Design a protein around this ligand. Structure first.
Ligand SMILES: *[C@@H]1O[C@H](CO)[C@@H](O[C@@H]2O[C@H](CO)[C@@H](O[C@@H]3O[C@H](CO[C@H]4O[C@H](CO)[C@@H](O)[C@H](O)[C@@H]4O)[C@@H](O)[C@H](O[C@H]4O[C@H](CO)[C@@H](O)[C@H](O)[C@@H]4O)[C@@H]3O)[C@H](O)[C@H]2NC(C)=O)[C@H](O)[C@H]1NC(C)=O
Ligand SMILES: *[C@@H]1O[C@H](CO)[C@@H](O[C@@H]2O[C@H](CO)[C@@H](O[C@@H]3O[C@H](CO)[C@@H](O)[C@H](O[C@H]4O[C@H](CO)[C@@H](O)[C@H](O)[C@@H]4O)[C@@H]3O)[C@H](O)[C@H]2NC(C)=O)[C@H](O)[C@H]1NC(C)=O
Ligand SMILES: *[C@@H]1O[C@H](CO)[C@@H](O[C@@H]2O[C@H](CO)[C@@H](O[C@@H]3O[C@H](CO[C@H]4O[C@H](CO)[C@@H](O)[C@H](O)[C@@H]4O)[C@@H](O)[C@H](O)[C@@H]3O)[C@H](O)[C@H]2NC(C)=O)[C@H](O)[C@H]1NC(C)=O
Ligand SMILES: *[C@@H]1O[C@H](CO)[C@@H](O[C@@H]2O[C@H](CO)[C@@H](O[C@@H]3O[C@H](CO[C@H]4O[C@H](CO)[C@@H](O)[C@H](O)[C@@H]4O)[C@@H](O)[C@H](O)[C@@H]3O)[C@H](O)[C@H]2NC(C)=O)[C@H](O)[C@H]1NC(C)=O
Ligand SMILES: *[C@@H]1O[C@H](CO)[C@@H](O[C@@H]2O[C@H](CO)[C@@H](O)[C@H](O)[C@H]2NC(C)=O)[C@H](O)[C@H]1NC(C)=O
Ligand SMILES: *[C@@H]1O[C@H](CO)[C@@H](O[C@@H]2O[C@H](CO)[C@@H](O)[C@H](O)[C@H]2NC(C)=O)[C@H](O)[C@H]1NC(C)=O
Ligand code: 7VF
Ligand code: 7VF
Ligand code: NAG
Ligand code: NAG
Ligand code: NAG
Ligand code: NAG
Lengths: 750, 745
């Protein structure tokens, strides 16, 4: 049983997760098998040539973010003993210099987010097996750091080097004598205002170059930002990229470009991805000679090139966009304009592989929506944060191109996706969706939409499968609401409320029944407290109901018992979420009227005083029961009498102070038991049993006020007699008493 | 010391506040001199005589909401003995009928929210001194009560009756034989679909009639709603209001009206307030004969008469609006239309007293703003929830109002400075160069929640340079330039709550130099701006500022700076008297950082942080401090010599901390302290004052004989008010656990 690290197999080697454990030094208790050691985010202050003796087989060490809340102190040759060390991460350690005497075996070294101002031969030129070297974020807006000093030729000996990152340092010019093995060169935010013909000569293998944030566009910049003199653009010689024939990725975001030299791409016939966000290229977008030079470009980003003070009627798209034959995704966020006409996008209608058009955040008032029918492979039409109306820190993330999917994958997987969230569609006009292609995934979130749904509003796109109506003011009282969407599978009505935001609103949920393949319904935070004519939800198809943030406390304390069968008619339900419903006590017969099909039941974050364990008998398929964050005091002593199906039982954040004699005997079915953050002082001999034996494999106990006398010795031995039962976060399974033990782990005892 | 009630004399009266105290019966422990008794929101199940015995001096009893989680049981003549009882409130008691044998002395009776289906002579006909009778919400969507049965003439004997409310009951018609003393008749949501000539005949003293919600407009209704068949309008005879010559208030909201008979107002020359919200009067608003009949109307409400599925280009306002010579406020919310032209409001431009135009929630895309210059007395232009853009080109509770939103349209504090324009929740995503041209002189401007990302540079507001109160909350503003907003040289109040970057990314930096440039700036609210560094300038400065709200930022980071750059951050606010540093995740304030707060402070809030220690000695540097608020932290100890450190402190708030010991020195005495709040701490006991309030509820008191000391000190100081005694609870020993410390020996 490992301590303090969680050790485990990964692929065909063994790993030690040892992060975020308040460790003040490198433990000497790591398993002998461990080849990768993550000690990030701890309180470690020193590394000597002894910290790692006893582990000569280490391949990888992560020491990032040490220490927390002076700096990390590393003796010379601390690591040169470790002859197999390939990867060493030393990020955010406040290193004042490259540690000296690093092992020759290193293939990857990260020294991101330190105070290293000098890059010397002493430090790295020996590391001839480096493939990837990360030196970003060392000299940026720090009064200490005037400029980064790169010893002439320090990289020239690194003849296997493929990735060099020096982004977020002040370099003023591209350092000379870079090895010809370089594939990716990151020089973002380095104050390189001029790129000569000489800078990238010799880098005939280069596939990526990042020069973003040199002569930034600082208008409305979140972080400090220093334009070039007179907001001039980065200055790139005409022949700067002539020998970069392999370049696939070019990032020129935020270089204040007003014009792009088509000659830059003369010898760059493979360019795949071009980022030109945060420039001034409204003009170039209109004319755009450079566009004729990019027949293999797959991703173009031209976002946030808007002109301050301007809200032009029209977008002006060069006809040259038609030469981007390989284009898969065009990002045009934050151009900012009023109207989009059919003819404005004519050039793009013939791009055979154009699947994503991103027009988020342009505040467009009007779109001729029929224009989207003229594209053969459009799969993502992203129109969030426009003004359509009713129709009657982290260094390893991308700083300028927001990278998460535009549309949730679960929605887009159904087919063609249109996102009109955060527009002004305050009701669904009778022509809202005419001339749209066949939409499978529609997002109308957060439009202040107060439509009275009656069964006709969506008939021009009747094959929507995933409909996101969250954060609106919708009236779905009519039993015909949304029934024109006979193929609907997923409906999200999270955070819906009345167009008055007033306590008292009633609901009618009869529309649910009409759908024969509706699978997932999310009614979260609808503050549902009463239903009108009908008091039962019904569906033969539904598998998942999310009912969090409503008032089942009121529904089930009804005088007339009108809601005791409220979910029973969901005949195929397997997952049910009744969290955040302010439940104190569920009537016994209300609980028995939940569908017997359930496999997963969540009643977390209510205020349950008691639970009737005996009723689990009516749920022969239940695998997961979640009762976290309640006020429960006792556990039944005979659980195996009530279920042979339950695998996962979550009880953390309750008020349990006692485990029954033979709680976990037999229990039988359980694999995962979570009793963290309860009020246990100890565990019994009798609460532990066997002959048994339990099929248990995880037991969570952290955050209980354990009494570390000799009474707990029973538990400690049972721990060693069941190495197979994992107990995570041992460091947080903490004696609260007696005083001399208070605060230590129960595992450190005699 | 009164218990369980808080008894206070005020004016002639002496109150007993006795509500929300988990009382299972009427205490017999109430001072003989008490005249108002509020017992509302308790667990009381029965009222007898004896239940009020030897309490002739009761004027008023409130028994509402008894009991809580069939109910309140009242014996006949339970109140018969109380010969001065004027006012009796019995709301939400689940009464199945009017209690019998109520005292003749009653002038006000409320029986709202019960199950009274029968109004009988036996119940009320003897109460000949009733002025105000409330019977609303008794037969409302109860299957058991099909209809409210009103005994013929039951009210006719009530010849002093001024107010009758029967709203939210199924009457189907106005009951006959109503007394002529009636001034206010409330008949909302009563299913009265027809009003005859006879119903209101001879109500010559009537000043208010409410008929709202009869034949409701149920489209998009929050509550269950049953139109008339099929959605026909309330039916009001031509002569229904002919003898109502004193009518001032007429509420016809939600009666599905398509047309208004001008004859209705023939004999109603003093009508002041007319509510026509939630009808279908788009047509009538265009033609509007009835408008010629209302020369003294002051408030007209035509809100939410939109036609489903329409978004018409234009609003059509009849010329006859020009006949509303007395109009002070016009409410036209939710008509829903795209464009407002100068000529559309021509009829209103000559109304001499029109001070409020309310066009909230019309989703108007464009307004010819110059039209607002043609009004004499416009003080409130309310344009929230429209769709105005950047301009670039030159040119439940029954006693609340169910259909007319009652709070001020614009915060009084802002409107008091003068002419007020509210453009919150529009689409003004940046301030266009013509945004404010052709506006009148605005003193109060609201631009909240427009997704506005303007880079403020000193020129955006120069067409309205006399703004004194500017609300910019909930936007994405850049105020990095030292010149931001300086064109508003008279600015007194600036609200930047919830501003953040138009990317919503942890990392945004701030420059607050603009603040110094203002000569008259008084109140600055920077709450929830997540401020964690300032660039170049590390000090806020101002000779004028009185109030800085700095909640929901990162003073924990600012004050744990390696080079101590922010040790003087607020030093330079020389006039500061109120400062809010709540919700700044503070664990510890450096001693010299605390001493660098302005010595002018009278009110300092550091609540809801996580303070482990507070250096009491430093209060010496704050000779004006009256109020120190440290609620919701983790503090362990109080100094024992507080009077050494201040003679100014009047209010000290320490609830929700971890204090387990109260020094014998505390009450130094600190003659200054008037209000001490030690609720929700960890006190087990207190042991061996100009103080007037001491809060102790929610401490785990040990009720052994060790608390006897405190108990006596309580009786030796009646002047020291202790609220919520019933919640000052023994947690131990077991046999005491859960009892009030007052019930002990
Ligand atoms: C209204 O309610 C619906 C229904 O609950 C919500 O939508 C669901 O949101 C949940 C959780 O947010 C989504 O569940 C997540 O699915 C992710 C995608 O799964 C990938 O890999 C799995 C492997 O089985 C495949 O099934 C799938 O095809 C994908 O390739 C998972 O990554 C998530 O992982 C979970 O578990 C792991 C470890 O256990 C953790 O790392 C994660 O933190 C996480 O717990 C997760 O299962 C679910 O897919 C959604 N369903 C649908 C239909 O959209 C809405 O979000 C809710 N609306 C609002 C406003 O709240
Ligand atoms: C300028 O544009 C270029 C592209 O032209 C862009 O380069 C990309 O940088 C990002 C961010 O550093 C790289 O993304 C990483 O890729 C590696 C390797 O597969 C992964 O290790 C990373 O994943 C880790 O971190 C993620 C978030 O931090 C986690 O999601 C994950 O769990 C991992 O721990 C990450 O995806 C990307 O590889 C390059 N692109 C190429 C082709 O090399 C560059 O960032 C832009 N510059 C700026 C300043 O914005
Ligand atoms: C139909 O329109 C009617 C107006 O024509 C609405 O009438 C109003 O009904 C409300 C709520 O039931 C009453 O409000 C209560 O009134 C008194 C206030 O008395 C005095 O004290 C305050 C203190 O400042 C002062 O401001 C006032 O001017 C009063 O002098 C209190 O008991 C309550 O707090 C509450 O305000 C209105 O009084 C009543 N108006 C009139 C003139 O009587 C009617 O509610 C509408 N119908 C529906 C269903 O919405
Ligand atoms: C940003 O900070 C601002 C300043 O702190 C916030 O505005 C202040 O909000 C408080 C309430 O939180 C208001 O104080 C209340 O004022 C009312 C009205 O008082 C009236 O009667 C009193 C009697 O003394 C009289 O003195 C006044 O002049 C008024 O006529 C009181 O009834 C309350 O009990 C309380 O004192 C401030 O008035 C208000 N200040 C200003 C300048 O508007 C603002 O809300 C914050 N913004 C956000 C989004 O949180
Ligand atoms: C519909 O659009 C809304 C608004 O953009 C999306 O809501 C965002 O969703 C992501 C993922 O849950 C969150 O991280 C953001 O915080 C959300 N923003 C807001 C303002 O809510 C939503 O995900 C989109 N729906 C689908 C199915 O893609
Ligand atoms: C400006 O407009 C905003 C939005 O209407 C007002 O915000 C309301 O503020 C009150 C009191 O602070 C709250 O009870 C409401 O929740 C707010 N509504 C919203 C949507 O935020 C704000 O008060 C207005 N400012 C002024 C000066 O009147
Ligand atoms: C993308 C974007 C642009 C703008 C904007 C457009 C035009 N002129 C602007 C001027 C500014 O000073 C600030 C922002 C803008 C505003 C909000 C936005 O989200
Ligand atoms: C005041 C208002 C009106 C409307 C609306 C206008 C026109 N036709 C509508 C049709 C609907 O089914 C629902 C709402 C409307 C929507 C939101 C609103 O806030
Ligand atoms: C479009 O995509 C397909 C499939 O990836 C690819 O085979 C084809 O070359 C692409 N067409 C063009 C013109 O790039
Ligand atoms: C119930 O849902 C499951 C999805 O888990 C599916 O296998 C099964 O066929 C469903 N049954 C019905 C009747 O929809
Ligand atoms: C649980 O519920 C049933 C009623 O459904 C009751 O008979 C049984 O004894 C209860 N047990 C407990 C511990 O509540
Ligand atoms: C400081 O505030 C006080 C009290 O509000 C006021 O009298 C005075 O004029 C203010 N001083 C300045 C410079 O604005």
């Amino acid at each position: 049983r490992s301590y303090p690290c969680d050790e485990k197999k990964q692929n065909d080697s063994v790993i030690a997760e040892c992060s975020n454990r308040r460790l003040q030094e490198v433990p000497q208790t790591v398993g002998k098998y461990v080849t990768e050691l993550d000690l990030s985010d701890n309180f470690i202050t020193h590394i000597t040539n002894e910290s790692f003796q006893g582990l000569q087989n280490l391949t990888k060490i992560n020491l990032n973010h040490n220490p927390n809340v002076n700096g990390l102190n590393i003796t010379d040759g601390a690591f040169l003993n470790l002859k197999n060390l390939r990867e060493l991460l030393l990020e955010d350690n406040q290193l004042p210099q490259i540690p000296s005497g690093l092992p020759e075996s290193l293939t990857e070294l990260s020294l991101i987010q330190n105070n290293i101002y000098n890059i010397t031969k002493e430090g790295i030129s020996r590391l001839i097996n480096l493939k990837n070297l990360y030196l970003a974020w060392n000299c940026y807006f720090n009064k200490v750091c005037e400029k980064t000093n790169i010893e002439d030729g320090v990289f020239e000996t690194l003849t296997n080097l493929e990735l060099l990152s020096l982004s977020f340092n002040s370099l003023s010019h591209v350092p000379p004598k870079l090895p010809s093995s370089l594939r990716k060169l990151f020089l973002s935010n380095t104050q390189i205002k001029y790129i000569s013909e000489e800078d990238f000569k010799g880098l005939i293998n280069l596939t990526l170059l990042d020069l973003s944030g040199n002569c930034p566009r600082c208008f409305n910049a979140p972080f400090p930002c220093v334009p070039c003199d007179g907001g001039a653009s980065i200055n790139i010689d005409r022949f700067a990229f002539q020998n970069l024939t392999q370049l696939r990725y070019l990032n020129l975001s935020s270089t204040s470009l007003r014009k792009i030299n088509a000659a830059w791409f003369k010898n760059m016939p493979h360019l795949k991805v071009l980022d030109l966000e945060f420039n001034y290229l409204v003009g170039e977008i209109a004319s755009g000679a450079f566009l004729t030079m990019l027949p293999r470009l797959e991703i173009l980003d031209l976002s946030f090139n808007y002109i301050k003070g301007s809200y032009p009627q029209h977008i002006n798209i060069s006809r040259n966009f038609s030469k981007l034959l390989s284009l898969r995704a065009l990002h045009l966020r934050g151009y900012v304009f009023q109207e989009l006409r059919e003819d404005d996008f004519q050039p793009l209608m013939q791009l055979p592989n154009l699947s994503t058009i991103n027009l988020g955040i342009n505040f467009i008032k009007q779109i001729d929506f029929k224009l989207f029918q003229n594209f053969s492979n459009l799969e993502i039409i992203y129109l969030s944060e426009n003004r359509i109306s009713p129709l009657v820190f982290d260094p390893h993330s991308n700083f300028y191109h927001f990278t998460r999917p535009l549309i949730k994958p679960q929605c887009a997987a159904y087919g063609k996706a249109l996102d009109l969230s955060l527009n002004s569609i305050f009701f669904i006009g009778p022509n809202q969706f005419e001339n749209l292609p066949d939409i499978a995934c529609l997002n109308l979130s957060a439009n202040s939409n107060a439509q009275v749904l009656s069964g006709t509003e969506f008939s021009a796109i009747p094959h929507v499968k995933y409909l996101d109506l969250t954060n609106n003011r919708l009236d779905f009282d009519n039993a015909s609401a949304l029934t024109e969407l006979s193929d609907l599978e997923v409906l999200d009505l999270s955070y819906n409320s009345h167009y008055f935001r007033i306590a008292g609103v009633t609901h009618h949920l009869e529309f649910i029944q009409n759908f024969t393949n509706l699978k997932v319904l999310n009614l979260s935070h609808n503050n549902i407290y009463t239903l009108t004519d009908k008091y039962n939800l019904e569906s033969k198809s539904l598998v998942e109901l999310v009912f969090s943030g409503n008032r089942l406390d009121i529904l089930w304390n009804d005088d007339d018992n009108r809601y005791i069968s409220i979910f029973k008619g969901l005949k195929n339900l397997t997952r049910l979420d009744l969290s955040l419903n302010r439940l104190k006590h569920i009537p016994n017969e209300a609980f028995l009227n939940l569908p017997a099909s359930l496999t997963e039941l969540h009643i977390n974050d209510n205020m349950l005083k008691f639970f009737n364990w005996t009723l689990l008998q009516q749920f022969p398929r239940l695998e997961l029961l979640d009762l976290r964050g309640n006020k429960l005091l006792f556990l039944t002593d005979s659980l195996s009498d009530f279920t042979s199906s339950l695998r996962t039982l979550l009880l953390s954040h309750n008020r349990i102070s006692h485990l029954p004699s033979g709680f976990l005997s037999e229990v039988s079915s359980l694999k995962h038991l979570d009793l963290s953050s309860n009020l246990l002082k100890t565990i019994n001999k009798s609460a532990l049993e066997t002959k048994t034996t339990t099929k248990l494999s995880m037991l969570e106990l952290h955050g209980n006020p354990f009494e570390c006398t000799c009474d707990i010795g029973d538990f400690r031995r049972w721990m060693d007699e069941h190495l197979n039962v994992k107990i995570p976060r041992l460091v947080d399974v903490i004696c609260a008493s007696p005083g001399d033990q208070r605060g230590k782990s129960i595992v450190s005892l005699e």
